Amino acid sequence: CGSIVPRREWRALASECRERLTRPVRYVVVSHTAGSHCDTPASCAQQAQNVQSYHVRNLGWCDVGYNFLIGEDGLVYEGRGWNIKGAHAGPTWNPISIGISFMGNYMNRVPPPRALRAAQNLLACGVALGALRSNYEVKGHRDVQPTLSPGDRLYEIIQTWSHYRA
Amino acid sequence: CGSIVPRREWRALASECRERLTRPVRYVVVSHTAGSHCDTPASCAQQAQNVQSYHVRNLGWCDVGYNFLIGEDGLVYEGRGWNIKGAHAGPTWNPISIGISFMGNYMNRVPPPRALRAAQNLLACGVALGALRSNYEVKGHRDVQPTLSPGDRLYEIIQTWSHYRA
Ligand SMILES: CCCCCCC(=O)O
Ligand code: NA
Structure with a gap:
């Protein structure tokens, strides 16, 4: 739960966001960036910057x-x-969800198991902190918005997750 | 609790080890490999193999x-x-410790923050699983064996850790 790359480490511009989420949050929405893929800490820090x-x-x-x-x-x-409301799933889902995005396009490829493990452990951490409800529901981006996000291959994987709810 | 690259994923030879540790384990011993370092999942899977x-x-x-x-x-x-007794700290410490090794030589170099985070969150996970005592003690390799392990720079860092006791 403490194995997250913090903002300053990937050289993030400072946040100006003020709107808070109401804990515990019921929903996780899984997206893809539909951006460039990255498989090294160097390349992924750059991708997060982009x-x-x-x-x-x-x-x-x-x-x-x-x-x-x-x-x-x-x-x-x-x-x-x-703790801060995202902009990832539109005005109905942003206030009641955590948005996690896999960096890449997963229309015709899967994230590697280490990416999937990172995501599953992130969600366990959220439960442990009281950020997420113990019984949180995972949604694909496409389940709450008209988009191909999170890509067909990644969408089919998250459908198998214990906490997935269509 | 927490995320870990499993044996098969880094293409590990099958283990022949049978001797079990008695949970909960009181001691963590931190070593370095004094080997080549690696900063990509590809290069580190290879390093673990080596x-x-x-x-x-x-x-x-x-x-x-x-x-x-x-x-x-x-x-x-x-x-x-x-759950399996290591070979990392000699016959007095092996049966009563978890041995974690940073892959590299930390005599004149620090591990990057992400390496340190991984190690600290691994130990939190051990406590959560009942593998480690809540009051576990961290030792440097050099504190229990005559060696420069885990390297001067990394040794100085682990001295600052919450659970460190010389
Ligand atoms: C606040 C919750 C932290 C729990 C410790 C185990 C973990 O690293 O998730
Ligand atoms: Na001491």
């Missing part, structure tokens, strides 16, 4: 929209974290 | 001697794990 740059500079958002990002390096990158 | 090869083929040991290895990629590699 995603945040797009969201802050181009979209004018207070921070990277996701609560956490997942690298194919098997590390979790701190986004808005447990 | 360390195990040395221990099994050359030293004739039943498995890699460490209970867990720590990569500069920020991942933990499963060694003998929580």
Whole structure:
């Protein structure tokens, strides 16, 4: 639960986000970035920077929209974290969910087991902290918004998860 | 609790080790491999293979001697794990300790924060599982055996840890 790459370590611009989530949060929404893939701590720190740059500079958002990002390096990158409302699943789901995004496009490829392990351990951590309900529900991005996110291959994997609910 | 690269994923030779540790284990001994470092899941899986090869083929040991290895990629590699007696700290400490080894030489270098985080969260996981006592003690390799292990720079860092006792 303490094995998250913190904001400063991936050279994140400072957050301007103020809106808080109400703990414990019932929902996890799993997205993909549909961005470049990365499989080294060096390449994934850069990728998290690029995603945040797009969201802050181009979209004018207070921070990277996701609560956490997942690298194919098997590390979790701190986004808005447990306590700050994300921008990842639209205005109905953002206030009542944690958004975790796998960095890449998983339409025609899977994240490696280390990426999946990182995500599953992140969610266990959320329960332990009281950030997530013990009985949290995992949704695919496409289950709550019109998108291919989180990609067909990754979507089929999260459908098998104990906490998945269509 | 927590995330770990399992034996099969780093292509480990099958273990022949049978001798069990008595849970909960009171002591953690921190070593270095004094070997080549690695900072990618690909390079660290190979490094764990190389360390195990040395221990099994050359030293004739039943498995890699460490209970867990720590990569500069920020991942933990499963060694003998929580339940099997290691070969890392000699015949007095092996039966009463978990041996975790940072892959590299930390005489004139520190492990990156992600490596240190991985190790600290591995130990929290051990407590959560009942593998380690809640009041476990961290020892440097050099505190229980005549060696420079775990290297001057890493030794100075583990001296600052909550559970460290010389
Ligand atoms: C606040 C909860 C921390 C629990 C300790 C085990 C963990 O690393 O998740
Ligand atoms: Na002491």
